[PDB]
Amino acid sequence: PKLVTWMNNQRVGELTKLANGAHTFKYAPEWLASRYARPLSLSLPLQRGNITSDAVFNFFDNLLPDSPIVRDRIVKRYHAKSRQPFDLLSEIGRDSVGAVTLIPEDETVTHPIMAWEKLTEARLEEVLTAYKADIPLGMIREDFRISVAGAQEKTALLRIGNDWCIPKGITPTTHIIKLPILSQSVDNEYYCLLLAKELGLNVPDAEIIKAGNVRALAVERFDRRWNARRTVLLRLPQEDMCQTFGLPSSVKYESDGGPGIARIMAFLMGSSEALKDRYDFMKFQVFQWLIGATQGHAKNFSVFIQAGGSYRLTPFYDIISAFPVLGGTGIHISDLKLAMGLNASKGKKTAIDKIYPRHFLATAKVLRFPEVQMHEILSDFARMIPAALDNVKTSLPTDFPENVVTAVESNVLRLHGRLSREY
Amino acid sequence: PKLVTWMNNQRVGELTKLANGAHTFKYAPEWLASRYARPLSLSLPLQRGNITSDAVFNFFDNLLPDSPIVRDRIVKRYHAKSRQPFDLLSEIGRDSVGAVTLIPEDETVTHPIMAWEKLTEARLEEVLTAYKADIPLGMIREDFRISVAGAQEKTALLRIGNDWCIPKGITPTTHIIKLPILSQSVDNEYYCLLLAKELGLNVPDAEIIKAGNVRALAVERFDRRWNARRTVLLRLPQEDMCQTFGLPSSVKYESDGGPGIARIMAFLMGSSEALKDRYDFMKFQVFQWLIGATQGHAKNFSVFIQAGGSYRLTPFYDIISAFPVLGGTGIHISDLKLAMGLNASKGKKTAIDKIYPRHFLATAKVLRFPEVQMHEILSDFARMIPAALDNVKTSLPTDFPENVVTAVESNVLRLHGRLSREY
Amino acid sequence: FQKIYSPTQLANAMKLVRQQNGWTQSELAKKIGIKQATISNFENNPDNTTLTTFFKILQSLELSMTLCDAK
Amino acid sequence: FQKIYSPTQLANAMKLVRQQNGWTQSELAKKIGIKQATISNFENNPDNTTLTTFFKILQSLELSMTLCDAK
DNA sequence: ACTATCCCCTTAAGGGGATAG
DNA sequence: ACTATCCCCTTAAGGGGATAG
Ligand SMILES: Nc1ncnc2c1ncn2[C@@H]1O[C@H](COP(=O)(O)OP(=O)(O)OP(=O)(O)O)[C@@H](O)[C@H]1O
């Protein structure tokens, strides 16, 4: 059965799975002329025919959870004909990231435009522990077709006024809720997100919800936005750097085949805010360094797909500190590596601990990124880390678990030392 | 004294002649931002400073008559400080071709916007014979500051209703009047212009005026055009292929240094009607062949300078048949050469008589001009020459001198033979 | 209309247009004197492509080009 | 705005703009990682000039580009 | 029928590095 | 102070000519 692709109620095209299991996609002659017209993916540009490239499959496979065990977790409840992308997509295909919406052709069913069943203080706790049993994406055995990409345990939800309401119909969620993996990962992030903001980085706000014997992180979605009259909840098109180059989740890490500093930076010259984005992607590199984050795999960077085929970086998201993991085990700062390597002389340095300011300016020297600009990113960190830290510390809830802050705040300063010692 | 440059009442800038006799030009910060803004010459692009290149001088020198004897003819009446471009330009600088208007800075003098003193049946004859004495451009000793480029004897005039009125003030003329050099050159052209039209070529209409013991050709100007309310007579900006590349009248002929088929054709790829103009410039080449015209020197092709710096070919103009010149003297079709050479194998054929269709397709082969298009220009001439000829013949006035037609019509057919014999 | 900021954005844009008017790389090429390979090249690797090639192709499509502010 | 139909029309256009904002070939070049010679080249021989160079320069001027009909 | 490649050849862009005017 | 050239090096556009899918 065909599968149609709409965006904020606008038929963009429709996905097709042939007999020989070949996934194809074709635009809608109509949408290829719409005011809103823009490619579903920079990797599937508007054209008249049927696209038949892996790029088609890759884009849609990257819409489902990264783990082969979670896939099977989904085929549980909903009797999907397989763990095959198309099938699941046909099942839990309504609230994917960005704004793509997959509805079977043979099924108009104008599902709930803006519906939601308010959760009970228990119900909330229920879904927030569906990972304890065998219920993926917190989709308990009680009208839920939401989708999120990634590897950890999560589930997105709606949030109207002061209630965590379960999305009903094709109603978009507003918050991507996360659960405890690394112990208090809910905390590691909530901290990492505050600090990032405090340093002038583009990151979404994040609030942590408590449900008895469980802690869950609730992040606000930068791919959602109320409309003019606070009537419709619109979904902003977007994609992760994997979809862009049309690669499979498989190559997320630069150490598999995924993209890294260069490719990416090159791609940004084509942004509508190129010179600026181009700059922020770098600043961030150096921040991922300081807090030693280690998930900088393509699938963690997103560009907004605007009309006419434009695009710009989306705020940075999902940042977790790989620091609380030192000491207790053999694991030490010398073992920590940066998802994307910066250049060096011996090849390309990729170890946080062995890394020094000089290494960034080397990279910022090849890629042609204004040396004078890199100097400024180093100088600004060299003198705001301290203040950034404290003005944050004095915010964490009086119950925020303490080593997390210490463990994260202390190594960070060590690393920063190299900076001040120069800038 | 400075010299200002206005176009249809719009200060574009102002020409300056330093002490060391260096001719300079600078735009007006104001005009460099006007709705109408466009370069005075493709050879003097809008920029902030003072232009100091020969290109400045070349553009303005190409506004005055080509003959060093006529220059002196002008310094006669008006006590110009010299035959130096600037000076004359300061004197008879009001009605030049295109739409440039030069008025001394130190002299606003809102001269007659739309004035004209109707000429008497004699007065007309007067100016039409000013070349017999020592009065250039028919500017007799009675408020006249008109300018025309070229080498033969001419003078432009206004034409309101049924009267040949002498332009008064900066009032633009409407017709470029020509006098008898080649005897009845007034006729050679008037014929050549009719035939050109009849074959679907872009050429201005032309009427011949009679003044007793003198015959004068009156051509309509394609660089003039009434405005909305038939109130203002606007001047359309333009320039000849010499000004374009910023070369001196000296190199008008390809056999001096001037431009030829290629350069020109290349330049046309940048037209706003490139693919079309590019085609017509060729068709014409082949026509200049058939009627054996021999004045195809850069200074005979013009592009309109539109807003934002655009440009397109102006209708072809000034076409005289170098045929009536055979027989009587040693002069024979083998002596006749095409101002611009087309390519060949032995180098570049340039002799009408030795030239055959094959030669054009050779040239149309290097310049990459669609062979299929050249085939069509040859085929259309191969079957309209005859009809074109007759439908014309039956028009010439019952007093039109007969060998001109015969002499021109007969050789033409000979040449055409090669065509039909193939297309 | 749509503001383009890259050769790739450009190619896709012009490709669409050619596709839309049912034109072939071969057609346009013959009209403006460039190789049909040159057009195939332009639609997949527009990063390195002479400006001249750009406008000829641009002319064969009967389109123009203007410069506007990136808001 | 003005419709451009040639690399030369283009250069003059962008040259003007740089001149207008009091910018130097050297300034823009340093911001978008290309040689100031590359910019000098672009303003006198734009016929043969990579599209990429085109847009970088285009970005340093803070302008965009769109495609419209040649009426 | 239509587009993507290819061998092959010459002219050159553009980055290094850098000075003449 | 600012832009036009330059020696020098590598990668390549684009035209010829032309076929694999
Ligand atoms: N706040 C958000 N707003 C919009 N899209 C988001 C947001 N958070 C995550 N996403 C989207 O979801 C995808 C995965 O999210 P995220 O990186 O948070 O997952 P994880 O933390 O599940 O990932 P991993 O385990 O691989 O590190 C991204 O590709 C991104 O497009």
Ligand SMILES: Nc1ncnc2c1ncn2[C@@H]1O[C@H](COP(=O)(O)OP(=O)(O)OP(=O)(O)O)[C@@H](O)[C@H]1O
């Ligand atoms: N009908 C016209 N409309 C507009 N401009 C014209 C017209 N006739 C001539 N011109 C302009 O005047 C210039 C010379 O005119 P033309 O070629 O008729 O002179 P000539 O016949 O005096 O030339 P030559 O003696 O060199 O062959 C051209 O450069 C052109 O721009």
